Structure 1
């Protein structure tokens, strides 16, 4: 419960206090109602059964208060469970766009996927499904044992002793099954990742003949997941045997003390018979704890994953904002350094862009051109050195102001699963249709609307799967142009377009009426046409820069890069 209390909203801790008080009142009423059978039946079995009425009235009040208290405990458990669901899920949704890009290792992406995948009714019903019966079962025999002290002192301690072995069984059963339950989760999460990779990479796997379960990696993960789940079923046998022994040990102790007292005359026979029924109520929580103990292990893993997402290191930010909106800003690097893990990408970049001009970044593949665009756009951040937009640090800039400053065309166009217009409109959802058509027309997406049957309502697949490579490239380019931001970064807008679509799109990157400081990335001389200055980057630093004809005349690495 300690982990679950971390995720509770601070605004909702009054409900938790109200919940914990009602849960205790649930147990105390249940135990009192059970132990109220000892004087009730003793009076009922006596020569004057009318004395049973007083204890029946106390039983009725204790039970009716139980129904009211248990309904309220359910209502608070539902509200707390769904309050934790909504706040934790929303906090993950708010945090994850600000989480560092380095956080998304393939293990963390699995954890984030499983954490988001916990949104179903299982996590939302956590407090009602697991926590309420677990606290009820854990404290019910303890409460009955305390309530038995009012009838007979040693009889109560015998019941309390039975609780001690139960909690010992609960502690031991969890320990025995812990290691196998952890391994089962690892293989079940790995198998999840392989199915998603299996479906997402069918063409390559089929061509490689690595698609059959006897030869596939998803098949191996299934085989591992089967053995991990079988050993878990074996390693929970000790836990089930231990709870059975605990129930029998407590049964022997309870029954042994009842007969021991009844032999002496210290306990009437009707009280002894009433204690057989209370003994049945005593032993019911012993079985319920055994049924819920495995669930407690899995839920601990679930919340640990959710807490892992909420513990992810977020990007640095600030509160600065640029002076005016949609003013073409200057962009400069000041000894910017960056590395993926230990692999250094950029090792001393320093340049300046004029406000409103268009400069073309060029260089070999793997040089770090997209990384330069990432730092300009703010997706990454330097380890040391700083990037300034209009003489204002991006790292100390507001998240929204930095977000509004840049619109980019990515190297690999990723489209969300939806209509073609839905992907374009992501650039500016509140843009009027007139500017939408302008962005579509400039990107030559209007040549896709006539050709495709459904026009802009065409349902794109996962990514841009239902569209060709060039089609998704143009839809991505329309998305970037639609956004009214005054900085436009272009990354491989040519890679999937034919010669006719290439030329129109490249020329349309200038026909954009708005004033912007544009950055173009390509490995093709024709695509860097109209560029005011070329930035040649190689081995993680700007090696050469100038004009297209200037460097070609100079015969530098820029010239050699086109001469092959």
Structure 2
């Protein structure tokens, strides 16, 4: 397979070539070591056993070479496994930061996790365990066919022609067995879909006093469908039985032809016995490959995963308040246009808001100016410099974000906030601390900023984690600052910290906000109301609110909802 070659490091080409050469040499010092049985057993069973010693001598003198070249192939295989594991792991870990975020559909993320995590021992033992036995057992039948075609030409031609028959039987057996497994999985999953339908809808049924009728209905359905599980045995019947029967049929056919030639006088009895022995040896590698199938299947799966992650799309590449521009930018994810007709030119150093229904494509805007995803259409620029054409290391110091999910890398509060600018002095850290208001949690936290605030370290609530994110984003010297919306009403101090971020920011830098609740829609300069990725409104805060537009209705609904108390109107 091409990908298994492409995974090779470029430095070990003189190692792969040596591996291939010594593998063919190993094949041709046991294939000849097998055909050399014929002079050996043609003397062993004959009237002159003493002739066996010479051919035994030149059998051991090739088995020793087989040992030496096998050792030199296997040590080289260990080296190549280690240096393909390291090479592909580093290539993946370099690729993934540059992978566009549109790739992380969560089956893709699951496969990437599997490739990164589960492939350690396997790749170290790829050539040693899978490929070397595969090649050494695949070439051996053809090698014996050629070596028994040069010697005793009427029979080697039959052996080489029957290699096709036996490999066809093996391939058909494997194909039918794989299809049988697929069919069994399909039928089993189809029968029990009703049980999952029950389990998901268990609460709504049980509270409705309908659990027993639904249980009876599902039981009746299962009983009705049960009887139709037998008719599709036509493909498991020729499973491993097909390969075993084909192998033994070929065995008996060759043995019968040998006995027929013996009776017809074209061969001697010892020659006809040694031919049978070699024609048994000619079959053994096929059984070895058939035994080796599941390892090949699992390695094909893992190589498919590594190929999929390796070929994932990757972004191209190459201190005042910048100007941010969208030149009629559009973007699509899945099977929908997550961004439709998006264009603007932000005046530098301003505060801007974004609002709309959740799932409408609001955070994807921040992903676009953040450089997380290249634009499908249009241009995204910073002071006219297209982000795709921006230099790689320079792009990472151009923008800052406060995400809807306040990700924390399992450090302390100081350690988490220090992400973005580790070189900042302690007074700057204290100033950002005061601005983000996380110091209020230090009055609650046991060990102050040194407390670990990972997922297992502290059960930090979403507003508080977002506040830590505001601190982190405020610290760094990004020319552009961005904020998202996950401000639950449980923490009003989080809203106060957001307000201070809009208003009390010391540094000069363009500010953009994405907002749902009142505190985050108040002090901006303009709003880009998003709906299904389409910017349906574009205007000032007062302009849109006083005009009675969609933003006005949204603000009215949010304010009315926030004012409610339970127990009366």
The TM-score, its normalising length taken from structure 1, stands at: 0.78
Moved more, 435-444 or 552-561: 552-561
Q: Deviations over 1:129-163 (max 9, x none)?
A: 22221222222233223333455333434443442
Q: Deviations over 1:463-513 (max 9, x none)?
A: 999432223222322332333322110112633562234214431455454
Structure 1 CA distance for aligned equivalents of residues 396 and 211 of structure 2: 42
Moved more, 473-482 or 264-273: 264-273
Moved more, 257-266 or 168-177: 257-266
Q: Deviations over 1:153-197 (max 9, x none)?
A: 334344434423221212212331343455689999999999999
Moved more, 56-65 or 223-232: 223-232
Q: Deviations over 1:365-391 (max 9, x none)?
A: 555432322221122344433222112
Partner SS for 1:228: coil
The alpha-carbon distance between structure 1 residues 58 and 437, as it changes in their structure 2 partners (threshold 3 A), is farther
Maintained 8 Å contact 2:99/2:312: yes
The alpha-carbon distance between structure 1 residues 310 and 451, as it changes in their structure 2 partners (threshold 3 A), is same
Structure 2 CA distance for aligned equivalents of residues 30 and 394 of structure 1: 60
The alpha-carbon distance between structure 1 residues 548 and 107, as it changes in their structure 2 partners (threshold 3 A), is closer
The alpha-carbon distance between structure 1 residues 534 and 281, as it changes in their structure 2 partners (threshold 3 A), is closer
Structure 1 CA distance for aligned equivalents of residues 132 and 462 of structure 2: 54
Partner SS for 2:150: coil
Count of residues in Structure 1 that have an aligned counterpart in Structure 2: 556
Maintained 8 Å contact 1:178/1:297: no
Structure 2 unmatched runs, 5+: 555-563
Q: Deviations over 1:98-148 (max 9, x none)?
A: 444443334434443444454232344232222221222222233223333
The alpha-carbon distance between structure 1 residues 495 and 159, as it changes in their structure 2 partners (threshold 3 A), is same
Maintained 8 Å contact 1:409/1:490: yes
Partner SS for 2:483: strand
Structure 2 CA distance for aligned equivalents of residues 89 and 219 of structure 1: 50
Maintained 8 Å contact 1:155/1:254: no
Q: Which residue of 2 aligns with 1:75?
A: 75
Maintained 8 Å contact 1:187/1:221: no
The alpha-carbon distance between structure 1 residues 550 and 133, as it changes in their structure 2 partners (threshold 3 A), is closer
Shift, 1:71, TM fit: 1.8
Maintained 8 Å contact 2:101/2:373: yes
Structure 1 CA distance for aligned equivalents of residues 242 and 437 of structure 2: 71
Shift, 1:283, TM fit: 3.3
Q: Which residue of 2 aligns with 1:464?
A: 457
Shift, 1:539, TM fit: 7.2
The alpha-carbon distance between structure 1 residues 3 and 331, as it changes in their structure 2 partners (threshold 3 A), is closer
Partner SS for 2:325: strand
RMSD: 5.5
- The 5-angstrom pairing of residues 205-284 of structure 1 reads 238-263=238-263, 266-275=266-275, 277-284=277-284
Moved more, 477-486 or 256-265: 256-265
Partner SS for 2:130: helix
Partner SS for 2:487: coil
Q: Which residue of 2 aligns with 1:120?
A: 120
Maintained 8 Å contact 1:177/1:232: no
| 1:12 is aligned to 2:5 | no
The alpha-carbon distance between structure 1 residues 216 and 458, as it changes in their structure 2 partners (threshold 3 A), is farther
Maintained 8 Å contact 1:409/1:493: no
Maintained 8 Å contact 2:340/2:535: no
Q: Deviations over 1:426-464 (max 9, x none)?
A: 434666666555544533333334534465565656699
The alpha-carbon distance between structure 1 residues 38 and 546, as it changes in their structure 2 partners (threshold 3 A), is closer
Shift, 1:405, TM fit: 0.9
Maintained 8 Å contact 1:363/1:369: yes
Maintained 8 Å contact 2:258/2:276: no
Structure 1 CA distance for aligned equivalents of residues 469 and 280 of structure 2: 68
Partner SS for 1:34: helix
The alpha-carbon distance between structure 1 residues 294 and 121, as it changes in their structure 2 partners (threshold 3 A), is same
Structure 2 CA distance for aligned equivalents of residues 206 and 468 of structure 1: 33
Shift, 1:62, TM fit: 0.9
Maintained 8 Å contact 2:354/2:528: yes
Q: Which residue of 2 aligns with 1:500?
A: 493
Structure 2 CA distance for aligned equivalents of residues 183 and 92 of structure 1: 34
The alpha-carbon distance between structure 1 residues 335 and 47, as it changes in their structure 2 partners (threshold 3 A), is closer
Partner SS for 2:232: helix
Structure 1 CA distance for aligned equivalents of residues 40 and 142 of structure 2: 21
The alpha-carbon distance between structure 1 residues 535 and 108, as it changes in their structure 2 partners (threshold 3 A), is closer
Moved more, 124-133 or 175-184: 175-184
Moved more, 39-48 or 156-165: 39-48
